[PDB]
């Protein structure tokens, strides 16, 4: 009779990536945040050790974002000041990381100079003491000039440079190696391209613990299950010995959740959905909650209250359920 607890032993574990440096490490940050180290399925403490809990980064742009009116409200006092923007996300809203999304680098938009993009990065480095996640706007030629110049001046800070895809990984990887920086690997909802990209980046002699996977998650209700299943498959592989899928999974819930009408549509427009306040808060929270069960290590959020609720969720899931 009796009951035996089934425990699936993991043959391997997910990589441990170090974000940021300190005074002794050659950086200027107050602390170093480590992600990964999981030796089991998401928050399964009974069959593995979850050493480092998932962290939450808040999106800060060098310019004023084109976010809906509702999302801009909690930032109105510092939304037009990146230095004061990042400083609020940490002290007030309690953020783990500062996600510096440079939309001002876009030649069609703000068209900020290369020395201006590096001025914004260096501004946040003086504002906060948390590790930074700096990615470009999306322009191939611009980001190659921006991210390179940023990595050169912010060398020693141990940042997390982002947006490196399959057809474009050569320019960014070369910068990360010389200036001792990490890198984000983006994949168009394809685990095959994801795994293949990690090989190409590593073949240039860049350590596996300096890479993080961006599966390009789908928004809630807009194909999030396509990303949910992939993130799980990556998690299984990382435990089964597949070292090319052993990189932590970063998610951009901020961009994908606030690009949906259901998040910011007024209640007067869609009476059946309800108030837009609770909806937008919960829409970004649920779309990030589900990914935590898929193995999301770094969440990139925007809404303050949405973060504060996911933070609570993480605090509860880290409570050891070991038998």
Question: Between 51 and 322, whose beta carbon lies closer to another protein?
Answer: 322
Q: Cβ closer to another protein: 182 or 216?
A: 216
188 is in an annotated binding site: yes
Q: Which of residues 266-305 bind another protein (CB under 8 A)?
A: 272-275, 277-279, 281-283, 285-287, 289-290, 293
Ranges assigned E (strand) in 206-301? 211-214, 249-251, 296-301
- Residue span 209-238 as binding mask against another protein, x where in contact by CB under 8 A, dash where not: ---------x-xxxxxxx-xx--xx---x-
Q: Please say which residue, 117 or 306, places its beta carbon nearer to another protein.
A: 306
Residues forming beta bridges with residue 61, ordered by sequence position: 101
* Of 118-126, 141-149, 167-175, 189-197: span binding another protein (CB under 8 A): 189-197
Among all chains, which residue has been given the structure tokens 């035996």?
4
Enter the tokens of residue 209. Answer: 């613990």
Contacts of 45 (CB under 8 A, 6+ apart): 320, 321, 322
Please, are residues 212 and 99 in contact by the beta-carbon 8 Å criterion? no
CB of 213 to another protein, least distance (A): 13
Restricted to residues 15-54, the positions that interact with another protein (CB under 8 A) are 43-46
Q: Which residues contact 11 (CB under 8 A, 6 or more apart)?
A: 239, 240, 241
SS3 of 177, please? helix
Helix or strand holding residue 192 (H, E): helix 191-202
Q: What gap in Å lies between CA 47 and CA 296, rounded to an integer? A: 18
Which of 13, 39, 245, 307 is close enough to bind another protein by CB under 8 A? 245
CB of 23 to another protein, least distance (A): 36
Q: Is there binding between residue 14 and another protein (CB under 8 A)?
A: no
What residue ranges in the chain does DSSP mark as E strands? 16-19, 33-36, 55-61, 97-101, 132-135, 160-164, 182-186, 211-214, 249-251, 296-301
Q: Which residues belong to the annotated binding site for 5-methoxybenzimidazolylcob(I)amide?
A: 188
* Residues that bind another protein in the complex, under the rule CB under 8 A: 2-3, 5-6, 43-46, 191-192, 195-196, 199, 218, 220-226, 228-229, 232-233, 237, 241-242, 244-245, 259-260, 262, 272-275, 277-279, 281-283, 285-287, 289-290, 293, 309-310, 312-313, 316-323
């Amino acid at each position: 009779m009796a009951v035996q607890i089934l425990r699936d032993r993991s043959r391997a574990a997910v990589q441990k990536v170090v974000l940021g440096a300190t005074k002794d490490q050659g950086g200027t940050r107050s602390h170093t945040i480590v992600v990964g180290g999981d030796a089991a399925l998401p928050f399964h403490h009974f069959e593995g050790e979850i050493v480092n809990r998932p962290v939450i980064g808040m999106e800060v742009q060098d310019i004023v974002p084109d976010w809906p009116d509702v999302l801009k409200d909690p930032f109105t006092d510092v939304i037009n000041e990146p230095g004061r923007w990042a400083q609020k996300c940490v002290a007030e809203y309690g953020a783990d990381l500062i996600y510096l999304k440079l939309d001002g680098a876009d030649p069609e938009g703000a068209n900020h100079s290369v020395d201006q993009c590096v001025a914004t990065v260096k501004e946040v480095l003086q504002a906060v003491g948390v590790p930074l996640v700096v990615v470009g706007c999306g322009d191939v030629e611009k980001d190659h000039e921006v991210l390179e110049a940023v990595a050169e001046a912010a060398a020693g800070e141990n940042l997390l440079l982002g947006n490196a895809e399959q057809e474009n990984y050569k320019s960014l990887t070369a910068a990360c190696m010389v200036h001792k920086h990490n890198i984000i690997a983006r994949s168009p909802l394809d685990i095959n391209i994801c795994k293949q990209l990690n090989i190409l980046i590593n073949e240039m002699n860049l350590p596996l613990d300096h890479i993080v996977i961006d599966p390009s998650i789908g928004g809630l209700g807009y194909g999030i299950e396509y990303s949910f299943s992939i993130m799980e498959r990556i998690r299984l592989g990382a435990l089964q010995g597949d070292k090319m899928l052993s990189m932590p999974v970063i998610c951009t819930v901020g961009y994908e959740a606030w690009r949906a009408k259901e998040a910011s549509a007024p209640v007067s427009e869609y009476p059946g959905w309800g108030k837009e306040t609770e909806r937008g808060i919960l829409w970004e929270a649920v779309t990030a909650t589900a990914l935590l069960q898929a193995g999301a290590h770094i969440l990139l959020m925007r809404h303050p209250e949405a973060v504060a609720r996911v933070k609570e969720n993480i605090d509860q899931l880290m409570v050891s359920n070991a038998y």
